[PDB]
Amino acid sequence: SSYAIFIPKDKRLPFITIHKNDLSDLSGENWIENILKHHDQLFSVEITRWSIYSRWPMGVLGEKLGNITDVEAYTNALLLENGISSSPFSDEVLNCLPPDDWIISHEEIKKRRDLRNELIITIDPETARDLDDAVSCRALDNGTYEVGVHIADVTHFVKPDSALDKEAASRATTVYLVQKAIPMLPPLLCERLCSLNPNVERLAFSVFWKLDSNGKEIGKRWFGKTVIKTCARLAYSEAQGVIEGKSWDDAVGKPIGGTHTPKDVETSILTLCEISRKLRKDRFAKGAVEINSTELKFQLDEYGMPNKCEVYEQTDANHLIEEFMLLANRSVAEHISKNFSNNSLLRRHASPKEKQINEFCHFLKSMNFDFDASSSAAFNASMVRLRSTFNEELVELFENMAVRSLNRAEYFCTGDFGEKTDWHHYALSFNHYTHFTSPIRRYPDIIVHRLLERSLKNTSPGIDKKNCSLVAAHCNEKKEKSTTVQEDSQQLFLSVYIAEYCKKHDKKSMPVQAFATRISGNSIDVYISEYGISNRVDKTIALTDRFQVYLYSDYSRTFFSIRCSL
């Protein structure tokens, strides 16, 4: 009892014990009271020794972390203000889990389709914690391809109406903050049995198409439970290299498992890229309206503070994966909404309301441009035009605006509408659509997986109309908070990165990517393409002119703010 207990924010480390004499700055004088007037702050510590007769290891207190304490406290209040639970999982949830020593049984591989000898890969942004989607592309003896999308079998461990399923249904989604993720499911799931890591056996839920170089299905689709063994884990920046010409050594310095070779894997990536160039050249012809919003990507330091900040730009590798996730979502929506026309969970997008339509066309006019919104086709066509009239920096903003202008997509029950025409998804231009490829971070995807499997066992939906509408409406609300805190946590770290730059130097972080729109003195409204994010300044300027600004910021723990001047 001459020691103090230090609990790391990192749950992977154990408890660390520091001694009354080792509290550095504050210790010694009624130290049990100093470590109590400091019960909120976060500190640094350095593990010293771990004696084979010490349960917990020893350490020596470092400095107080006022800045980190500040960041973690805002993040904590933002999650509460929005009703997102971020506590540890109850003991009733952790007991509906399979045991830590769970393994794929031979009897389980036997009632499934065995794909462990197939060439299956995963591609992801190189962060986050989720790994539940994978892809494959086998060339056939005709000039045909057996493409496949392989999703983690979350509903093999997550059983209907269990405590574990009730807590997931309540969270309804995973929340992605800049410095961490609030999981919908426990670690044993996100990290192991439902993570498609390489060179390891995982259970999955696959979909197989028979395609050609134009993208047209030339064979019957296939759904069912599979066993897979992904052979590579790529990143978009790595997968983008293989597409622009680079080899599988420079672009991707990792080994490959199974009998597959760096060559066997590039040709099956490059085929997936050409096919996705077709499918996507087909999507825009049926009316689809793909814009691209803008989100921030940070690089964090040893303490977890922003150390780099860029606007993340989507690439060809990105559009290659989306195109087959869209396809897997379409195919699964169509299938279940034709065996269960009243109990299926689907997703739809509606045409914009003139309130958030014409009032956006107006803004387009302000800069001397006419926008056409009479259809989906007209909307995308107006955006393809648009991109050929204004700058590339301004292009970022308007696209982001377009998004805000277009309606929000929403889950719904097929039983509540009866008419297929209402199932339509405006932006995608699909007649059927749901969410299927992310059951580890979404809960609607878990209902759809159970509906798909129940349409494969020739059985009843398992879920009813009322309870389906209940999920659809709960996941719609929870996902609007989730999206709100996610962009707000990105704006918080922008304020911190700005502050933790002028604190390493002085006065403000000077940006020159300001454009001008529009009026109402004394107030100009600006858009700093660098970092995206609109702002305001309150010997001549006018709308469309570009100039350098200021960007000053202060933050935490109840507020953050980014403010620019001239």
Swiss-Prot record:
The record marks 132 as: Important for catalytic activity. Its EC number is 3.1.13.-. One of its GO terms (biological process) is polyuridylation-dependent mRNA catabolic process. It is an enzyme of class 3 (hydrolase). One of its GO terms (molecular function) is metal ion binding. It comes from the Eukaryota. Disulfide bonds: none annotated. Mg(2+) binds at residues 124, 133. Its cofactor is Mg(2+); Mn(2+). It is found in: Cytoplasm; Cytoplasm, P-body. Keywords: Cytoplasm, Exonuclease, Hydrolase, Magnesium, Manganese, Metal-binding, Nuclease, RNA-binding. GO terms for cellular component: cytoplasm; cytosol; P-body. 3'-5'-exoribonuclease that specifically recognizes RNAs polyuridylated at their 3' end and mediates their degradation. Component of an exosome-independent RNA degradation pathway that mediates degradation of cytoplasmic mRNAs that have been deadenylated and subsequently uridylated at their 3'. Belongs to the RNR ribonuclease family. DIS3L2 subfamily. This is DIS3-like exonuclease 2. It comes from Schizosaccharomyces pombe (strain 972 / ATCC 24843) (Fission yeast).
